Amino acid sequence: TVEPVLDGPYQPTTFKPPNDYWLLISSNTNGVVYESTNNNDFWTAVIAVEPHVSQTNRQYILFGENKQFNVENNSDKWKFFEMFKGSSQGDFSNRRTLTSSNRLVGMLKYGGRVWTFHGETPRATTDSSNTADLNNISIIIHSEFYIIPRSQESKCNEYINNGL
Amino acid sequence: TVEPVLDGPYQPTTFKPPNDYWLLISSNTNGVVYESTNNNDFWTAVIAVEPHVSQTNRQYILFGENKQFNVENNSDKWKFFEMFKGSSQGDFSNRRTLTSSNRLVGMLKYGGRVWTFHGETPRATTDSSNTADLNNISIIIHSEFYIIPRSQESKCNEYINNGL
Amino acid sequence: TVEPVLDGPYQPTTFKPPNDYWLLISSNTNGVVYESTNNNDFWTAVIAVEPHVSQTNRQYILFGENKQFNVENNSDKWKFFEMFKGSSQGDFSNRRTLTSSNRLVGMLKYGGRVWTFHGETPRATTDSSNTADLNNISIIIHSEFYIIPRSQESKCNEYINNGL
Amino acid sequence: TVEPVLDGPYQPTTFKPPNDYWLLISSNTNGVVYESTNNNDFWTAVIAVEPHVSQTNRQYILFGENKQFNVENNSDKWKFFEMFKGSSQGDFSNRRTLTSSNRLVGMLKYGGRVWTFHGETPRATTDSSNTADLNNISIIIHSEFYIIPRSQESKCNEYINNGL
Amino acid sequence: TVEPVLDGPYQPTTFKPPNDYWLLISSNTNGVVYESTNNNDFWTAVIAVEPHVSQTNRQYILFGENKQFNVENNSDKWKFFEMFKGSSQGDFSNRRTLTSSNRLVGMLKYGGRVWTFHGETPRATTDSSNTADLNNISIIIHSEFYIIPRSQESKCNEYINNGL
Amino acid sequence: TVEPVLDGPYQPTTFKPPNDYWLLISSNTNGVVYESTNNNDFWTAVIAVEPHVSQTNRQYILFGENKQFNVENNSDKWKFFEMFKGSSQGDFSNRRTLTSSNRLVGMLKYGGRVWTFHGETPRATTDSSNTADLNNISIIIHSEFYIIPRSQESKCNEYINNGL
Amino acid sequence: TVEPVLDGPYQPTTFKPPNDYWLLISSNTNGVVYESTNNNDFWTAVIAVEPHVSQTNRQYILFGENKQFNVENNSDKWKFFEMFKGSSQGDFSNRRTLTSSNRLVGMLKYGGRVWTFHGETPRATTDSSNTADLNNISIIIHSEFYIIPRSQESKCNEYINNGL
Amino acid sequence: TVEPVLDGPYQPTTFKPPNDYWLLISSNTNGVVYESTNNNDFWTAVIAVEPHVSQTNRQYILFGENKQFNVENNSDKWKFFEMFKGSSQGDFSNRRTLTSSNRLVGMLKYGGRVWTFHGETPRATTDSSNTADLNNISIIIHSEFYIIPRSQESKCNEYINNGL
């Protein structure tokens, strides 16, 4: 067989992504994977925690602010925690988590929602979050990433769940 | 798991606190924990008494005035006594008490009233006090404290009753 | 995760609800949701009006009496109107209103007051009304309902604002 | 090691106890533990209240009379309340309290006085009560008990404070 | 003589004040007098400190954020401290101060600048700060205030310096 | 009543004026009223044009240079045109105009800027111009003038708009 | 209004004009208006013909050479004919013509081209000719002329089309 | 004449005294007058010895420890000995002595130090002791006492040296 490799990778960047494309972000270290917000009703930062981390306080810079969390990862796999708030001075909560051996997270802007993958590989699945201002969601991506058309989510799911 | 660490500890201060936020005040010694008044119809001072104190006379400065109290704590737990008066030259009375192994007290302005935790850990509950002037209630806080939105009262309750 | 379901549903009933518990009442048709009074200084009936109702005369039986109202709901959400009178022969007035996509209202007897939820989902908030005679408030509930302790108000809020 | 066991357990009885011996009374239920009087100037009844009893009216038969009290126990320990009056017609008052995880109370006639343990285990201590007629003090004991000479009060102390 | 009274008092409010009018703001308690920002390059909050305040920690809410300061006022007069930051991320600094017996501050939007009064009454004088974005400066005013045209600055000065 | 007469009239002169004083310059003929510059970034000359002048070429000496202008004034009021350049070899432009029945112009150094009156009497208003070198601004004044402190600007305004 | 007159006039002259300036040349007689060349790839001479000239041979000196042309002007306006050649010994041709009641022609060196006005007033428009050696274009100007910055072509067009 | 009396007499107590007030402690018997410590780097107990005490061993309880000293007072005046240690397990030494016919001692927290009166009445003077933790110095006061602001130290002086 001969198949094109998916589009990318792109270097870490800041932009307002176009609607209708999955960003498939490949995390290669612990800490902050990305920081996404429209500065209105949506803030999500993804935090990466390596395998076998006993419960302890870890500190991160989220949207310019120093924030601490009690972090634990009992698994042999990486964990990617979506930390969400809905107002500029709300509190972050862990809205959802991806446990993964492949170290890829997914983010799509479409149809008034932001869609991502959560659960545990190789059976992670999609979920979504509503927003009233989708287009102005901007993202600071801290790692290399690929871009996949919405029509190819089947492939995005395959990559999330089984790797590239 | 990833769980945020509390908003604090803020250092001792004088503060006109906002409505709808718990102050979770962490007492590290015996004596006056805080002094709260609107200089109108509400004065509350909380006095901390360590475990196993036989009946004895202790003197404190409350709102600039020296006053002596007969103090006793025959329990294994700290006790935090709310001393209330309703006028400027009025007499103090012990309105409520929190008996606690965790050395935290709470104060909330909400619904036109002041709320605190009373009873005995780990089954302390909230209770309210009326005032005609909630907005001008200023608090001199003698110990470090945390700030928790009323929407997270279940966490505040957990900390009061089981500790940090 | 494993989380308990709410305590309920209880069938339509008449009783003097205990203090310290939220009743979360689940309406499944337009009309009278409940009728609450102590026959002294407090009468509240909640009237449910479906989405997109043009100005019109609707009649209800409130505490045994036929009463007509001029009713309108311009919204895509249900409206739950609290109709209050403060004496046996007094007139009803719309004291507060919950605009909701979830069709749940809340009522708590506590601390000399009846507390309810008003405003617009998913950001509805609590409010209260004073009474001199709390304990004698009895309620005729026309729809199924759930019971939530006062200490679990954030859970009650979540159901009011996001549904079952 | 080989050490004698306590003298007992004597079963519930009415007894005019000898001077210079402790009665160590083992309570296995709530209610009246014992009723002690000389029918002259000394009446003491001990009432047992289980952990976590909310404030309420409870009734007891004391020296053949129905008596009610407002009772509360906010703690995880049992509470044993000494109710005293000094005259046949007089009113009962709560003179002392033992808070205990071990459910043992103590009574000694010695040196012209009656002695009991009070305070909170494991730091309970003895205290005395005066009477002009020690010898004729007789006791209705509702639970099994042991008899320990005063010369072995240190053993009595240990059992009160750490259990059998 | 017959002379008009000032235009006011207007109640505490939030608005983008029109250019070309002095706001003469009348402080009747310590704490935050007003909070003004364009969310771009200009943030000023004015903090009122009563006479004879010994060095101490005071906490305020400034643009939704809890902030503590070391505060002192050695004088017989009130002090109104302008706390400035020039970016959303930046730190507050005390840019200028009005020391006043009359408890009035002034704020004018005009000509690419915000103009205020500083120094010490009765000889307080104007000063200004530049902005790239004057028109979008909005203010939350916590106290009553009056409105004086730019052409009547001498009147504004007279009130600042001699009182109403 | 007793009211002072103005400080003046000072005779034509070359002057580096102090900050915070209005020069109220009284023009008694057509042509150049004054020439002001810091020989750095600010040159302003004011040209007086009598009522009812049809379009015509007039020549003046400005800062030692001959320059011709196309001049018109179809009104019944005098017009005073500010001709500005920002560099030594720069071109003049008509930056501002005062249309006036009273034949007075004003110039003030204040707040790091130069201020003049523009618009049309009796509703002329002040306006400002920036410069990096306010101190070295020297003015050749061709007509008699008065000096008014900025604290008396309301009087200056009255004279500009209604005459002496 | 008061507006500066355009820069000039300058007496007839010979020079290599600076790039970025329109020369606006004011013809006051018939014959040769100017002679411009780089002695490489560009020769333009402008010839002026008065109104109402019947077809006849007229002679001119162009770049030191006696040249004859068949000339006609049927118009009530002046005509200014650009006579061009591209090499030292090449023949002149009438490349473009300005018909004008205002008797002004325009010449600009910019961006590898010489730009002039052609057509008929009051709707003459700009045109251009390319050259490989713009800088060394020298001009003998036979009439008074003005100089206008390239940034002010709007004004140059106005003068060409409507006069000064 | 009419002059205020001293603030007091406050009865025996344990007190964390405010800075900048003298405590004037009135001794009416021999033994321990007060015990002061921060439990860090400062312990002072004052012992009172009556006139005409021949050299002998006397025992005192200081900070809960039985301590003996060799004591003598050959004078007709009372003697008040400051016994100091600088650490928890350090040895007490006699640091200062007040010999007095008036039986008053003084203690002030001020300027980061502790101040007391020493020497012999009516010529007793003040002296200071250093500590790294002034604020936490607390005192068990065995006799009645008065509180005098430091601004009235001359009155304190007079009373120490000449009596109440």
Side-chain angles (χ1 to χ4, degrees):
Chain A
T1 52
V2 171
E3 301 298 337
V5 182
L6 76 171
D7 184 49
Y10 295 88
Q11 302 166 44
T13 198
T14 300
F15 73 141
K16 292 168 176 181
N19 300 339
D20 251 17
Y21 295 89
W22 283 98
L23 306 185
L24 184 69
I25 301 164
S26 181
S27 176
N28 72 178
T29 190
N30 59 7
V32 183
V33 180
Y34 70 77
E35 301 161 87
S36 180
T37 190
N38 57 15
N39 289 128
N40 177 1
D41 70 0
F42 183 89
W43 283 255
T44 296
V46 169
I47 295 158
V49 182
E50 71 271 23
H52 303 313
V53 172
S54 60
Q55 176 64 249
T56 199
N57 187 312
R58 290 186 171 186
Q59 184 159 322
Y60 309 88
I61 300 182
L62 309 180
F63 307 95
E65 297 185 342
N66 278 275
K67 294 286 168 196
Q68 300 189 330
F69 302 90
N70 292 319
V71 171
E72 187 179 65
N73 182 1
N74 297 327
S75 176
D76 62 311
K77 303 183 182 163
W78 282 78
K79 287 179 179 285
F80 301 97
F81 298 90
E82 293 185 25
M83 306 313 293
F84 175 79
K85 68 177 179 170
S87 68
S88 66
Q89 291 146 355
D91 290 340
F92 287 98
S93 61
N94 179 206
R95 186 157 178 181
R96 53 178 78 83
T97 304
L98 180 70
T99 305
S100 169
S101 64
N102 311 303
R103 302 174 70 181
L104 295 161
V105 299
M107 197 286 298
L108 165 71
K109 287 163 64 170
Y110 175 88
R113 296 191 185 168
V114 178
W115 312 72
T116 62
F117 285 81
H118 79 132
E120 187 166 329
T121 63
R123 297 263 294 263
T125 63
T126 62
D127 196 27
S128 63
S129 299
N130 299 343
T131 172
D133 186 0
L134 182 62
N135 295 1
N136 281 312
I137 289 173
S138 175
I139 190 172
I140 305 177
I141 304 174
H142 297 216
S143 298
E144 292 181 10
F145 68 101
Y146 300 85
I147 302 175
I148 302 174
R150 186 175 66 87
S151 66
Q152 297 189 317
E153 162 178 348
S154 294
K155 294 186 199 189
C156 189
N157 179 276
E158 169 65 15
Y159 296 134
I160 290 280
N161 273 314
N162 303 292
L164 304 177
Chain B
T1 55
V2 171
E3 313 181 339
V5 177
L6 279 182
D7 182 20
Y10 294 89
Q11 297 308 297
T13 198
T14 299
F15 187 28
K16 291 186 193 191
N19 291 344
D20 305 336
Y21 288 88
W22 281 100
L23 309 185
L24 180 67
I25 300 163
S26 179
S27 174
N28 68 315
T29 194
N30 62 15
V32 179
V33 179
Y34 72 74
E35 301 160 86
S36 180
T37 185
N38 55 19
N39 289 117
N40 178 357
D41 68 1
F42 184 92
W43 281 258
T44 298
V46 171
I47 296 156
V49 183
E50 72 273 23
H52 286 295
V53 171
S54 45
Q55 183 56 252
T56 200
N57 183 313
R58 291 187 179 178
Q59 182 164 329
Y60 314 93
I61 307 284
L62 305 180
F63 310 98
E65 301 181 339
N66 286 272
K67 188 62 206 183
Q68 301 191 333
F69 301 82
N70 291 320
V71 177
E72 180 180 77
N73 182 1
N74 293 316
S75 85
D76 278 3
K77 288 177 186 173
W78 283 78
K79 287 183 177 275
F80 300 91
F81 297 87
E82 294 182 23
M83 307 308 298
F84 175 83
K85 61 180 185 171
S87 75
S88 322
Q89 1 195 48
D91 288 22
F92 280 108
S93 58
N94 175 211
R95 188 163 181 177
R96 303 180 180 89
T97 307
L98 180 63
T99 297
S100 167
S101 61
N102 305 306
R103 303 177 70 173
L104 299 164
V105 300
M107 195 285 308
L108 167 73
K109 299 162 55 165
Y110 158 69
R113 299 179 175 180
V114 177
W115 306 71
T116 58
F117 283 80
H118 74 144
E120 183 166 335
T121 62
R123 304 194 179 192
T125 59
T126 67
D127 191 44
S128 70
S129 298
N130 280 319
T131 170
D133 185 2
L134 189 63
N135 291 351
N136 285 308
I137 287 175
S138 169
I139 187 178
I140 304 173
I141 306 172
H142 297 219
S143 291
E144 74 194 353
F145 66 102
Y146 306 91
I147 297 178
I148 301 171
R150 203 183 70 92
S151 61
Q152 295 170 33
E153 177 164 309
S154 72
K155 292 313 292 203
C156 189
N157 187 302
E158 168 71 8
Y159 296 134
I160 289 281
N161 277 308
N162 302 288
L164 299 175
Chain C
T1 54
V2 170
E3 285 267 358
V5 304
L6 283 182
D7 182 20
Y10 294 86
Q11 293 308 297
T13 198
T14 297
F15 74 140
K16 286 176 198 172
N19 298 343
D20 266 25
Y21 292 90
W22 283 98
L23 305 193
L24 179 69
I25 296 161
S26 178
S27 173
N28 75 4
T29 196
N30 61 8
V32 182
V33 180
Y34 71 74
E35 301 160 274
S36 179
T37 186
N38 56 16
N39 299 113
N40 173 6
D41 73 353
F42 184 95
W43 284 253
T44 294
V46 168
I47 295 162
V49 181
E50 70 270 28
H52 304 119
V53 166
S54 291
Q55 178 60 243
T56 198
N57 185 313
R58 293 190 173 181
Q59 185 162 330
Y60 307 98
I61 299 176
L62 306 182
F63 309 95
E65 293 180 330
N66 284 276
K67 296 293 180 193
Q68 293 188 341
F69 302 85
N70 291 313
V71 178
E72 179 180 75
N73 183 359
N74 294 338
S75 79
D76 58 335
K77 291 179 182 162
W78 283 76
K79 287 181 181 281
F80 298 94
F81 298 91
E82 291 187 28
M83 308 307 299
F84 179 83
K85 69 179 198 180
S87 56
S88 175
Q89 307 289 243
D91 311 320
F92 284 104
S93 58
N94 174 214
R95 181 157 179 173
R96 57 178 71 85
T97 301
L98 176 71
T99 300
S100 162
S101 68
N102 304 306
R103 301 176 73 174
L104 299 159
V105 300
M107 194 288 306
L108 169 67
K109 292 164 58 174
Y110 171 80
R113 294 192 183 165
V114 175
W115 313 70
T116 64
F117 283 80
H118 76 137
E120 186 175 351
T121 65
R123 305 277 189 97
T125 62
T126 56
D127 198 14
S128 63
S129 296
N130 299 334
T131 180
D133 193 11
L134 185 65
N135 290 356
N136 286 315
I137 292 173
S138 177
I139 190 171
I140 303 175
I141 302 178
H142 295 217
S143 297
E144 289 181 344
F145 67 104
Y146 308 82
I147 303 176
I148 297 173
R150 178 174 77 88
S151 65
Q152 299 180 15
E153 186 183 323
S154 61
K155 291 191 189 187
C156 194
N157 182 302
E158 287 160 13
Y159 292 115
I160 291 280
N161 277 314
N162 306 101
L164 303 162
Chain D
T1 62
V2 171
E3 296 301 332
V5 302
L6 291 187
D7 187 35
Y10 291 93
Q11 296 303 296
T13 194
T14 303
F15 184 35
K16 177 187 138 196
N19 292 348
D20 304 338
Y21 292 85
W22 282 98
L23 310 185
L24 181 70
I25 300 168
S26 184
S27 172
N28 69 349
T29 193
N30 63 10
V32 181
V33 183
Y34 72 73
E35 302 162 84
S36 176
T37 189
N38 58 17
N39 303 106
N40 174 15
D41 72 354
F42 185 97
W43 284 254
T44 296
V46 167
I47 67 176
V49 183
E50 73 271 22
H52 301 132
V53 173
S54 301
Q55 176 62 248
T56 206
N57 180 317
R58 285 187 174 187
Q59 185 156 326
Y60 308 90
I61 302 171
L62 306 184
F63 310 93
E65 292 175 344
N66 292 294
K67 297 290 184 284
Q68 297 182 337
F69 306 90
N70 295 307
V71 173
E72 180 179 72
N73 179 358
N74 295 333
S75 85
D76 65 335
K77 296 183 186 169
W78 278 79
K79 286 183 186 277
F80 299 92
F81 298 90
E82 290 177 31
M83 306 312 296
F84 177 81
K85 65 183 190 177
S87 68
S88 162
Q89 305 280 245
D91 297 309
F92 283 100
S93 58
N94 174 214
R95 187 168 182 177
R96 316 187 166 79
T97 305
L98 179 70
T99 301
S100 169
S101 62
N102 305 306
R103 302 174 71 172
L104 296 164
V105 299
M107 195 282 307
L108 167 73
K109 294 158 57 159
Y110 156 71
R113 302 183 178 177
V114 175
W115 309 73
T116 61
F117 285 79
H118 68 93
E120 184 167 331
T121 61
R123 297 172 98 268
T125 57
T126 69
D127 215 331
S128 69
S129 298
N130 293 177
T131 174
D133 187 14
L134 179 72
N135 286 356
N136 293 321
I137 291 173
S138 164
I139 187 168
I140 304 170
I141 306 166
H142 294 224
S143 298
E144 72 185 357
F145 69 97
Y146 311 85
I147 301 177
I148 301 175
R150 210 186 146 259
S151 68
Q152 300 188 324
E153 182 169 305
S154 280
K155 298 184 209 298
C156 193
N157 286 165
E158 169 67 13
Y159 297 132
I160 289 280
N161 279 309
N162 304 108
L164 306 169
Chain E
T1 55
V2 170
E3 296 179 37
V5 304
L6 286 181
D7 183 22
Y10 293 87
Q11 294 311 291
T13 199
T14 299
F15 72 143
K16 286 176 193 170
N19 301 337
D20 264 22
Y21 294 87
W22 283 100
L23 302 195
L24 180 70
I25 296 161
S26 179
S27 181
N28 78 3
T29 195
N30 62 7
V32 180
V33 181
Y34 72 73
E35 302 160 86
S36 176
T37 188
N38 57 15
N39 290 106
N40 174 5
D41 72 351
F42 184 96
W43 285 254
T44 293
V46 164
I47 295 161
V49 182
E50 71 271 23
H52 303 122
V53 169
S54 294
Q55 178 59 243
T56 197
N57 185 312
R58 290 193 177 181
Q59 187 162 327
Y60 307 97
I61 301 187
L62 305 184
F63 308 95
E65 312 184 318
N66 281 277
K67 302 289 190 196
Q68 296 191 157
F69 301 85
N70 291 314
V71 179
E72 178 182 74
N73 182 358
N74 296 333
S75 82
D76 60 329
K77 288 177 188 167
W78 282 76
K79 287 179 178 280
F80 298 93
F81 298 88
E82 290 185 27
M83 307 307 298
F84 177 83
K85 67 180 189 172
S87 63
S88 56
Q89 301 290 314
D91 308 321
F92 284 104
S93 57
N94 176 211
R95 183 160 180 165
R96 60 179 70 85
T97 305
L98 178 71
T99 302
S100 164
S101 68
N102 303 306
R103 301 172 71 175
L104 300 157
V105 299
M107 193 288 304
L108 169 66
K109 291 164 57 177
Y110 172 78
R113 291 191 185 168
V114 176
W115 311 72
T116 67
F117 281 82
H118 77 138
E120 191 176 343
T121 64
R123 312 231 322 191
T125 61
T126 57
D127 196 20
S128 62
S129 297
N130 301 330
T131 177
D133 189 17
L134 183 64
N135 291 355
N136 285 313
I137 292 177
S138 178
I139 189 169
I140 307 170
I141 298 172
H142 297 217
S143 287
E144 20 174 78
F145 68 101
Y146 306 84
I147 301 178
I148 298 169
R150 183 173 71 86
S151 63
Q152 296 179 18
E153 187 183 322
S154 61
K155 293 195 147 48
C156 190
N157 180 298
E158 173 58 18
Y159 295 115
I160 290 280
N161 278 314
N162 304 287
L164 297 165
Chain F
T1 57
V2 171
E3 306 306 334
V5 177
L6 273 188
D7 183 20
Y10 291 89
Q11 298 305 297
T13 196
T14 302
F15 190 26
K16 296 183 201 289
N19 294 340
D20 304 339
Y21 290 84
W22 281 101
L23 310 182
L24 181 65
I25 300 167
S26 181
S27 172
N28 69 337
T29 193
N30 60 18
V32 180
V33 179
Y34 72 73
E35 302 162 84
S36 181
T37 184
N38 55 20
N39 292 120
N40 177 2
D41 69 356
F42 183 93
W43 281 257
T44 297
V46 168
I47 296 156
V49 184
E50 72 273 23
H52 312 299
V53 171
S54 57
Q55 183 54 251
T56 196
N57 183 312
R58 299 183 171 179
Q59 182 164 327
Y60 313 95
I61 307 276
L62 307 177
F63 310 96
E65 293 169 346
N66 284 275
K67 178 77 197 177
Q68 295 191 340
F69 302 81
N70 290 317
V71 176
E72 179 180 76
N73 180 1
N74 297 132
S75 90
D76 275 278
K77 285 178 189 172
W78 281 79
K79 289 184 176 273
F80 300 92
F81 296 89
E82 298 182 22
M83 309 308 299
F84 176 81
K85 59 178 188 171
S87 72
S88 317
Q89 303 201 325
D91 290 11
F92 283 107
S93 54
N94 173 211
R95 185 166 183 178
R96 293 183 188 89
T97 306
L98 178 67
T99 298
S100 172
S101 60
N102 307 306
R103 300 178 70 175
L104 300 166
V105 301
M107 194 284 309
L108 166 70
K109 299 160 63 156
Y110 158 69
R113 300 183 174 175
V114 179
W115 305 72
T116 60
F117 283 79
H118 75 139
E120 186 168 332
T121 62
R123 306 194 179 189
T125 58
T126 64
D127 194 39
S128 70
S129 301
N130 278 147
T131 172
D133 186 0
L134 188 65
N135 292 346
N136 285 298
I137 286 176
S138 168
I139 187 177
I140 303 172
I141 306 166
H142 296 218
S143 289
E144 69 193 0
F145 67 102
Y146 307 92
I147 297 178
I148 304 169
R150 204 183 70 91
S151 64
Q152 294 172 29
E153 175 165 312
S154 70
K155 297 266 72 166
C156 189
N157 187 304
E158 209 274 344
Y159 294 132
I160 290 282
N161 278 307
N162 302 290
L164 305 173
Chain G
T1 53
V2 169
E3 295 303 331
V5 181
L6 79 167
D7 187 42
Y10 292 90
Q11 299 155 40
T13 197
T14 299
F15 74 141
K16 289 169 185 185
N19 299 340
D20 249 20
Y21 296 88
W22 283 99
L23 307 182
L24 184 71
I25 299 163
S26 181
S27 175
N28 71 343
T29 191
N30 64 8
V32 181
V33 178
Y34 73 75
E35 300 163 87
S36 179
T37 187
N38 56 15
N39 283 129
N40 178 9
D41 68 5
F42 184 89
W43 281 257
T44 297
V46 166
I47 291 155
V49 182
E50 72 268 26
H52 301 318
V53 169
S54 54
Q55 176 63 251
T56 199
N57 182 314
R58 291 187 167 184
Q59 187 158 318
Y60 308 88
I61 302 183
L62 307 180
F63 307 94
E65 296 188 332
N66 274 275
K67 293 293 176 183
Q68 298 189 330
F69 302 89
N70 290 322
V71 174
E72 185 179 67
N73 181 4
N74 297 330
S75 176
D76 57 271
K77 306 177 182 173
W78 282 78
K79 286 183 181 279
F80 300 94
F81 299 90
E82 290 182 28
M83 308 307 299
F84 175 79
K85 69 178 177 174
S87 65
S88 322
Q89 270 128 2
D91 310 354
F92 289 99
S93 59
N94 175 208
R95 185 158 176 185
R96 1 176 133 79
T97 304
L98 178 72
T99 303
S100 176
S101 66
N102 310 305
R103 301 171 72 177
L104 298 157
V105 300
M107 198 283 309
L108 166 72
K109 288 162 55 165
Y110 172 89
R113 294 189 190 176
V114 179
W115 310 72
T116 62
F117 287 78
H118 80 133
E120 191 168 328
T121 64
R123 280 226 217 164
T125 62
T126 288
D127 52 72
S128 65
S129 298
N130 281 246
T131 173
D133 187 358
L134 179 66
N135 289 8
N136 283 310
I137 292 174
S138 173
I139 189 171
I140 306 174
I141 303 175
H142 297 217
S143 297
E144 289 178 13
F145 68 100
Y146 297 88
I147 306 179
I148 300 176
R150 184 175 65 89
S151 68
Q152 293 182 343
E153 165 172 346
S154 296
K155 298 188 202 172
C156 189
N157 181 280
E158 170 68 14
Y159 297 136
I160 287 282
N161 283 305
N162 303 295
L164 304 173
Chain H
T1 58
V2 172
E3 300 302 332
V5 303
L6 295 184
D7 186 38
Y10 290 93
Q11 295 304 294
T13 192
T14 300
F15 185 33
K16 175 167 142 258
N19 292 348
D20 305 338
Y21 291 87
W22 281 100
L23 309 183
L24 184 69
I25 301 165
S26 186
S27 176
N28 70 350
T29 192
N30 62 9
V32 180
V33 182
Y34 73 73
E35 304 159 86
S36 177
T37 189
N38 57 19
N39 297 286
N40 170 12
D41 76 355
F42 184 96
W43 282 258
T44 297
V46 167
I47 292 162
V49 183
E50 72 273 22
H52 297 119
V53 170
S54 304
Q55 174 63 248
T56 205
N57 183 313
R58 287 190 175 183
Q59 188 157 323
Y60 309 89
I61 302 167
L62 307 184
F63 309 94
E65 295 169 15
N66 302 324
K67 297 291 177 175
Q68 299 181 334
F69 307 90
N70 295 308
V71 171
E72 185 179 67
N73 179 356
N74 296 332
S75 88
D76 63 324
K77 296 179 189 169
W78 278 77
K79 289 183 184 278
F80 299 92
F81 297 88
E82 291 182 29
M83 307 311 292
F84 177 82
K85 64 178 193 186
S87 62
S88 150
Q89 294 185 333
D91 299 315
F92 285 100
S93 60
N94 175 215
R95 188 172 181 172
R96 303 191 174 85
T97 305
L98 179 70
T99 300
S100 170
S101 64
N102 306 304
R103 304 172 71 172
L104 294 163
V105 300
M107 194 284 311
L108 168 72
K109 296 158 56 161
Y110 157 71
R113 302 181 175 173
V114 174
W115 305 74
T116 63
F117 282 80
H118 67 92
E120 181 165 339
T121 62
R123 293 187 51 163
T125 58
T126 67
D127 194 32
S128 67
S129 301
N130 300 350
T131 176
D133 188 7
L134 181 69
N135 290 0
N136 288 314
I137 290 171
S138 175
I139 188 168
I140 303 167
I141 305 166
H142 293 226
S143 294
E144 68 186 358
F145 68 98
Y146 309 84
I147 299 174
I148 300 176
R150 203 187 67 92
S151 74
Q152 292 174 0
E153 181 166 311
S154 282
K155 289 272 159 170
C156 191
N157 249 324
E158 169 68 8
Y159 297 130
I160 289 280
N161 277 311
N162 303 288
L164 306 172

